[PDB]
Design a binder for this molecule. Structure first.
Ligand SMILES: NC(=O)c1ccc[n+]([C@@H]2O[C@H](COP(=O)([O-])OP(=O)(O)OC[C@H]3O[C@@H](n4cnc5c(N)ncnc54)[C@H](O)[C@@H]3O)[C@@H](O)[C@H]2O)c1
Ligand SMILES: NC(=O)c1ccc[n+]([C@@H]2O[C@H](COP(=O)([O-])OP(=O)(O)OC[C@H]3O[C@@H](n4cnc5c(N)ncnc54)[C@H](O)[C@@H]3O)[C@@H](O)[C@H]2O)c1
Ligand SMILES: NC(=O)c1ccc[n+]([C@@H]2O[C@H](COP(=O)([O-])OP(=O)(O)OC[C@H]3O[C@@H](n4cnc5c(N)ncnc54)[C@H](O)[C@@H]3O)[C@@H](O)[C@H]2O)c1
Ligand SMILES: NC(=O)c1ccc[n+]([C@@H]2O[C@H](COP(=O)([O-])OP(=O)(O)OC[C@H]3O[C@@H](n4cnc5c(N)ncnc54)[C@H](O)[C@@H]3O)[C@@H](O)[C@H]2O)c1
Ligand SMILES: Nc1ncnc2c1ncn2[C@@H]1O[C@H](CO)[C@@H](O)[C@H]1O
Ligand SMILES: Nc1ncnc2c1ncn2[C@@H]1O[C@H](CO)[C@@H](O)[C@H]1O
Ligand SMILES: [Cl-]
Ligand SMILES: [Cl-]
Ligand SMILES: [Cl-]
Ligand SMILES: [Cl-]
Lengths: 413, 414, 413, 414
C-alpha cells in the first residue's frame, strides 16, 4: 500500500505543498493541460526522487495526467515525512520513503518499486535504472523510456550506454537549459548555504569556504558564499572552469593546499573521495565539511571514522569527530546532500522549471513510444525554450522582440 | 521561581548552548577571568534579552562573576524554550520567558524582574529601564547602572535623558564599534535572510527586496540580499545614507513608489508605521512583509488585521492576510524581529563581541560605582578596542603594527 | 608598401607592444614553436583586425611562422598608429590602417588587401571574407581557409553558408571556449567601462546603466557595471538569458521602459537599431549612449542626427546632441566599439588566448589544406583545452588531477 | 604673474572644465549665490589643490564670490596643464603649477603663494599651512582661517594643534560626511583603478590585489577591485577595520605575508614606508606597486632606486625597476597619487560635494571672522546635511520624510 513514517502528518504536508505551489506556475499549466489530455492513461510509473513539497507537486501533475505512480526516496535524509503522508492520504499515490530509513529499507523500496513493473521510470542519481538493468532484464519490455534528474545520473547513464546496456530511451532532464542553468546553479547556491546555516547557525562572513568543483553547482555555491561575505577557494580538475573561477575573483588551488586553509568545505564534483584522509590531518581545528553532490562518497567519511577516536552529535545534522590530538572535524548531514539533509532542498521556484521539464519529458517518451532510438535523448529545444518563456512570463518580466528589419539584417552578409 | 515552557528541554538547550560557545572565545576569556575575580559578588542583576544560546553564554559568564541574575524575554517570539530550560535546570538561573507568551505574561515578567531589586539592569529595547523609571522611583537607590543592547533602546534612553529622568548611568552597548559595526550589520544581514528562508524557503534570486532604512542594519540586509541574487530597493528619510545606497548600486525611492514593486519588504528603521495601509493597498498579490527592527510597530499590522477579511497560517511563522478585494499580503513572524522569530538570531561569532561589551560594561559600572555621572555613557575606547583585538586574534588573523619611525611620522607636521 | 599615419611613431609602438607581450605567454610559446616549424612557409595571408598592441603580437607570431602578412584595420577608430608604425618599421609587415580614416580609405584598404591574393584570411566582423565572396569569385582558388574573430562575423558566415556561398573552410575562432568565455566576457567587461571612463571620467556608482543583450559580452558588461556601483538594467530578446540576468540580480525590462530610466546605455547585441528614435525622445537629459557590439549600427545615430538641432564635441570621443527642447543625448565614440574607440581595447591577457586560438586555427587550415569540408569548422577541443592548460599554468595556478580510483568510479554505473 | 606649462592649452582646458561642471550642480548653486552676495569681497585667498577640472570649478566659484585667489599645485604629477592654462587665460586667476615640475619649483610656488598674503588658505595635505606657521609667524594676522581637503592634512593639523602652534581656525573639510563618505570611498575606488588601467591596460580580473589600509579609501579600492574580478588582500594596523575587511570577504594578513602573493599593491594608509625593501625582495617578478595615499612616502621608493641596477620607462606613467638578481618591480606614477598621476582623479560627481564643503567652509570662516576659537573645526552639521540634501535632489532621487506621529514616537520613552 505504502511505507511512510506517520500518516497523521498529512495536513502539514498539504499545507507546505500548496505553499510551494505558489511559485510553481509553469508546472501548474502543464498539470492543468495534462488533466484534459491524460497523456499517461493506462501508464504505470515510478519516481525515485527527493520526497519534498516540489516533488509532490510533480507527482500531482503526473497523477492528473492519468499515471499510476509510486514514489520512493532518492536519499534517506531528504525525505519529508509530512509530504510523504499527504501524498498517500490526499491523492492515493503509494509512497515508500521514510526520513532516516536505513539502507536495507532503501533497497527494499527499490525492489517494491520495480515490482510495480513501471512503463516510465523517473530517476535521480540513476539508482533504479541501474538496478533495473542489472537485476530485471526480463522487465525491459515494459520500458517506454526513463528520465534522469541530476548530473551524477547522467554520468552513470553514459557508462550504461558505453557498456552497451542502455537499450532504451533515457531523457536527459538534468542538461536542459531551464534545468541546470537554474536548479543546479541558483537553487543549489542558496539551499546549500541554507542547510549549513540551519545545521550550525554559523556566520559565513569572514570564513574561508572551499568549494570543490566549479560546474553548475560549484558556480552557484561559490557565488552565494562570496555574496554572504566569505573568502572563497575553488578546486578543480579542468583548466577552463578553473580559469573562470580565478577571473571571477576566487582563489584556485589544489585541495591539498586548500585543506590547510578552509573553515567550511563543500564538495560539488560528482566524483569520489574529493576530500581525503591526507586532507583531514591538516585541517583547522573545528573545520566543517559537507557535500552537495548527489552521493555522500565525495567525502571519505569511512577514513575519517577510523582516524577519529570519538564521534559525537553536537547539533541537528551535525557530528563532531575528535582526532587523537584533540582537533575536531565537523561533518554536517553525514555527508549527504546538505541542502536536502539539513534543510528543505531547492526553493520551488527552480523546481517548477525542473519538473516542468520532468513532466514534458515523460509526455515526450509516451507520445513517441516505439519511435525513439535507444540511448540518451536531449530535451527538445522548443520544449526547453517554451518553459523559459512561461517562467519569464510568470515572473512578471517582459522583454523585446526583433522587428522585421532586425530579422532581415541578421540574414544579410 | 521561574516561568518557562518545559524544563525537560534542558538537554537540547545545553547542547545548543555548548555549540554556540565555540565561536564565543572573547566571552570565554572574560568568563574565565570573572570566575577568578568575582566582579559581581553581592550584585543582583536583571537581564532583559532575547533568550538565545548566545544570551545563555552571557548569563553563564555573569553567573561566573558572582552575579545573582534573573533573566526575562525581550520579545515574546524570540525565546528559545530549550535555552530557558537549560539555564534553569543546569545553572539555577531564574528565567521568566515562554516562546509565544501573550503581552500580559510579558508585562508580568517585567514586574517580577523589577521585584528582584536589581543593582545592574541589562536591557534590550529599554522596556525594563523605562518601567523602572516610570513606576519604581522608590527603587532607584538600588541602581549602580544599566546597559542597553540595541539602537531603539538607545533612542529611548536619549528621550529619557532629555526628559531629565535618566538619573543613573546607562552604558550604550549598541553604539560600541565592536557592537554595531558587526552585530547590526553582518549579523542582521545574514540572520534576517535566514529567518525569511526558514519561514518560506522562497528563492531570493530574482526577487525585488525593499529594505526600509540604510543604517547599520539596513546596510547588512541589502548587502546580503544583493549577495543572494535579489534586486534591492532602499527607502530612507535622510540624504546621507540615501546617497550611500545609490553609490552601493541600489535603487533609492520613497516607500509609496517601492510599495508596488517589492516582492519582499524588510523594515530596519527603528521608526513607527514605516509600512502603512496606503502601502498594503498597492502591493503585489502575495508580497511578503517582515520586520527586523526591534519592535513590530514598524509595520502597521493593526490596520492590516482590520482591513483583511481573513488571515490563515500557511507555513511555520507565516500568515496570509486576504484583503477584501482578494489580494494577499504575507507576514512573517507576526512582524516581530524576523531573524529571531523564524530562525535563531545572529550567529554567535558576532554576539561574542556584543556580549563581551555587555560583560565588560557591567564590570565597568560596578568598579566605578559612585563615580559616574548620570546619563548615557559610551563604552570606554580601551574596552572597545581590546574586544576587537581579542576577536581578531581568535579569528586567526594577524596584522601589522607601527614602527617607531611611523609613529614619529604621525606626530610630525613640518 | 603600406598606408599608415606616421612612421616616426615606431619606438612608441614597440614599447607598448612588448609591454603587452608580458601577459601573452601562451602566444609566446606558439610563436616560439612556429619559428622552428615554419607552418606558413610560402603562404600569403591577410589580417583584418583591430590595429592594437595585441594584434601586433599575433602578426609577429605569424611572421615568425613564415607568413607573408598584410594587416588592415577592422574599424577606423580602433587603429593605434604607433603600433601600425612599429609593424612596418621593425618587422617589414605592410599595414594599411590609419586612426580615423574615412570610409573611402577603409574600402580602399580592403581592395589593397585582396590584391595580395591571400591564401589565409583572418577576419573580424567578416568584411573582407564577404567582399571576397561578392567581388572576387575568381580568387577563390587561392583560399585554403579563413578565420573569424567576433560573434557578428560568425552570424554573417551563417548567412553565407545558408546562402550557399560559404564554399571554403572558415575557422570559428570566436566560439572557442578559451576565446569568448574570457575575451567577450571579462575583456569586454573591463575595457567597455574603460572606454566610457577615459571618454568622460564619469562616476559609474549611483548611475542606472542599461545593458542591451545578456550574452557573453552582456554578462561581462553588466557584471563589471554592478561591480563598479551601478544599478544595472538588462534588455533581451530571448527568455533563457533574460531569466539569467534576473536571477543575477539585474532588472530585466523592454528597452522602451529602460529608455526613461538609463543614465548610460551600452549595446552588445550584434543586432541592428537596438536603440531607436522613439527611445531618444524619452531619455533623461544628458543620458549617455555607446556601443560595444562589433558594428556601430546598434544605435540609430542617423535618426539621432536628424532629430537633433545641434551636435558638438564636448570631450575626447564624446559628442553632445542637443534636441529642439534643449535636452541632450551624449554619444561616445560615434557609436563605434567604445572600448576600442575611446581606450585601447581588451587587455592583452585575454587576447593571448584569443590569438593563440587565431594562431593555431591558421595552422589548422594549412596542416589540413585540401582535406576540410566547406563551411564552418570549430576549434578542435584538444587545441581549445591545451590553450586553457597553458594559460592556467602561466597564471601560476595549480589544480587537481583524478586518481586511478576516481577514474574507475566514473566508469561504473 | 603665473607659472604654467603652456597657455595655448586653454581651449582644451575650458572644454574639460565645462564638461566637469555637468555633474557639479551643488557647486553651481553655490557659485550662483556667491555671484550675488559676494561673500569673499576684499579677501585674498590661496588654494593648494590638485589642478584639475574640478578644482577649476571651485576656483571659479570662489572668483564669483569676489575672492582674489592664487592657485598652486598640491602634487607635481597631478597638475592638468590645460586647466592651468584656462584659469589663467579665461579667468585671470594666477596659477603656479606645471605638470611634472621638480621639487625646487614646487617649493618656490609655495613661497610665491605665501607672498600673496592670503586671508583664507585652502590646503590639500597641509604643505602651505605648515610652511606658513613654520616660516611666516609675522604673517599670521592676515589669517581669517584655513581649510584642509585630505586625511593626511588633518593628521598634520592635529599634530600642529598638539604642538600649540595652530593659532587660527582650520576647517576639517575631509571629515565632513558629504566629503570622506563619498570622495574618499567611491571616488578613490573608481579613480585609483582608472589610473592603474590607463597606465598599463592590465586585466584586473584574476589578479591578486593587495590593499594596504582599510579606512575610507581602502574600503573603496578593495570594493572596486573586487567588483572588477580581483582577488583582494587587505593589510592593516588596527583590529576594527581588519575584522570589517574579513566580514566583507577579503583576506587580511600582514604585509610581509601579502608581499609574496600580490600582483598589484595599492597603499592608502596615510603612513610612511608601508612597503619596504624587505617586501620588494620577495615580490613576484613583475609585481605592480602604486600609491593612492596623499604622499609618495607610503612606498620606500628611495631604497628601491638604490637597490635596483636599472630603471626604464616601459609605458606612460610606468617604470620598470630591475633588481640585481634580475627580478622586476613595476611602479606607476612614481608612487604619487595614482588616480591623479595616471588618470584624471575623482569624477566630478563626488568632487561636487567635497568642493561644496570647501566653498561653504570658506564662507563660514569669513562670516565668523573674529568669532572662532583657534584650532580644528568640524564642518557645521547644517552645512554638511544641506550639501547632502542638494546632491540627492540633483541626483533625481526622492526619499521619505517623518510624519508628525513618527517624530512623536522618537521623543517618547514610556
Ligand atoms: N544538492 C543538490 O541540490 C544538487 C543539485 C544539482 C546537482 N547536484 C549534484 O552536484 C554535482 C555536481 O553537478 P554539476 O551540475 O555542478 O556538474 P558539472 O558537470 O556541471 O560540474 C562539476 C564540476 O566538478 C569538477 N570536478 C570533478 N571532479 C573534481 C575533483 N576531484 N576535484 C575538483 N573538481 C572536480 C568538474 O571538472 C566540473 O567542472 C553532481 O553530483 C550533481 O548530481 C546536486
Ligand atoms: N534584528 C536584529 O537582530 C537587530 C540588530 C540590531 C539592531 N536592530 C534594530 O534594527 C533597527 C535599526 O537599527 P540600526 O543600527 O540600523 O540603526 P541606525 O541608526 O544605524 O539606522 C537606521 C536608519 O533608518 C533610517 N530611517 C529611519 N526612519 C526611516 C523611515 N521612516 N523610512 C526609512 N528609513 C528610515 C535612518 O535614516 C537610518 O539611516 C533598530 O530598531 C534596532 O534596534 C535589530
Ligand atoms: N567590443 C568588443 O571588444 C567585443 C568583443 C567581443 C564581441 N563583441 C561584439 O559584441 C556583440 C555581442 O557578442 P556576444 O558574444 O555577446 O554574443 P552572444 O550571441 O553570446 O550574445 C548576444 C545577446 O544579445 C541578445 N540580443 C540580440 N538582439 C537583441 C536585441 N535587439 N535586444 C536585446 N538583446 C538582444 C541575444 O539574445 C544574446 O543573448 C557582437 O556584435 C560581437 O561581435 C565586441
Ligand atoms: N588619492 C585620492 O584621491 C585620495 C582621496 C582621499 C584621501 N586620500 C589619502 O588616502 C589616505 C588614506 O585616507 P583615508 O580616508 O582612507 O583614511 P582613514 O583614516 O579612513 O583610513 C586609513 C586606514 O589605514 C590604516 N593604516 C594606517 N597605517 C597602516 C599601515 N602601516 N598598514 C596598513 N594599514 C594602515 C588605518 O588603520 C586606517 O584603517 C590619506 O593619505 C588620504 O589623504 C587620497
Ligand atoms: N542570537 C542573539 N542572541 C541575543 N541577542 C541577539 C541575538 N541576535 C540579535 N540579538 C540582539 O537583539 C537586539 C535587537 O533587539 C540587537 O541589538 C542584537 O544585538
Ligand atoms: N579630481 C580631483 N580634483 C581635485 N582634488 C581631487 C580630485 N580627486 C581627488 N582629489 C582630492 O585630493 C585629496 C588627496 O590629496 C583627496 O582628499 C581628494 O578630495
Ligand atoms: Cl505546455
Ligand atoms: Cl578583558
Ligand atoms: Cl602549442
Ligand atoms: Cl547653500
Amino acid at each position: 500500500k505504502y511505507d511512510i513514517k506517520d500518516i497523521s502528518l498529512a495536513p502539514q504536508g498539504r499545507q507546505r505543498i500548496e505553499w510551494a505551489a505558489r511559485e510553481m506556475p509553469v508546472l501548474k499549466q502543464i498539470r492543468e493541460r495534462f488533466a484534459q489530455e491524460k497523456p499517461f492513461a493506462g501508464i504505470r510509473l515510478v519516481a525515485c526522487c527527493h520526497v519534498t513539497t516540489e516533488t509532490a507537486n510533480l507527482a500531482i501533475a503526473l497523477h492528473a495526467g492519468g499515471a499510476d505512480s509510486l514514489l520512493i526516496a532518492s536519499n534517506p535524509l531528504s525525505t519529508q515525512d509530512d509530504v510523504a503522508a499527504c501524498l498517500v492520504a490526499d491523492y492515493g499515490i503509494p509512497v515508500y520513503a521514510i526520513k532516516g530509513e536505513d539502507n536495507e529499507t532503501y533497497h527494499r523500496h527499490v525492489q517494491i518499486a520495480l515490482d510495480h513493473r513501471p512503463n516510465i521510470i523517473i530517476d535521480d542519481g540513476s539508482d533504479v535504472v541501474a538496478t533495473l538493468v542489472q537485476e530485471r532484464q526480463h522487465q525491459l519490455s515494459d520500458i517506454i523510456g526513463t528520465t534522469e534528474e541530476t548530473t551524477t545520473g547522467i554520468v552513470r547513464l553514459r557508462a550504461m550506454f558505453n557498456d552497451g546496456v542502455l537499450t532504451f530511451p533515457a531523457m536527459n532532464v538534468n542538461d536542459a537549459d531551464t534545468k541546470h542553468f537554474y536548479d543546479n546553479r541558483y537553487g543549489t547556491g542558496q539551499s546549500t548555504l541554507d542547510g549549513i546555516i540551519r545545521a550550525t547557525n554559523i556566520l559565513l562572513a569572514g570564513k574561508t569556504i572551499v568549494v570543490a568543483g566549479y560546474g553548475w553547482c560549484g558556480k552557484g555555491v561559490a557565488m552565494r558564499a562570496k555574496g554572504m561575505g566569505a573568502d572563497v577557494i575553488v578546486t578543480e580538475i579542468s583548466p577552463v572552469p578553473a580559469i573562470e573561477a580565478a577571473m571571477d575573483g576566487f582563489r584556485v588551488m589544489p585541495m591539498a593546499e586548500a585543506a590547510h586553509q578552509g573553515d567550511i568545505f563543500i564538495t560539488v564534483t560528482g566524483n569520489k573521495h574529493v576530500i581525503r584522509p591526507e586532507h583531514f590531518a591538516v585541517m583547522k581545528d573545528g573545520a566543517i565539511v559537507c557535500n552537495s553532490g548527489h552521493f555522500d562518497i565525495e567525502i571519505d567519511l569511512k577514513s575519517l571514522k577510523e582516524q577519529a577516536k570519538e564521534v559525537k552529535e553536537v547539533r541537528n545534522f551535525t557530528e563532531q569527530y575528535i582526532l587523537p590530538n584533540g582537533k575536531s572535524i565537523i561533518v554536517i548531514g553525514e555527508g549527504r546532500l546538505v541542502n536536502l539533509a539539513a534543510a528543505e532542498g531547492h526553493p520551488s521556484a527552480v523546481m517548477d522549471m525542473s519538473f516542468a521539464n520532468q513532466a514534458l519529458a515523460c509526455e515526450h517518451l509516451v507520445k513517441n513510444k516505439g519511435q525513439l532510438e535507444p540511448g540518451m535523448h536531449s530535451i527538445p529545444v522548443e520544449v526547453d525554450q517554451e518553459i523559459a518563456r512561461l517562467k519569464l512570463q510568470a515572473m512578471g518580466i517582459a522583454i523585446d522582440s526583433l522587428t522585421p528589419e532586425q530579422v532581415e539584417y541578421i540574414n544579410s552578409w
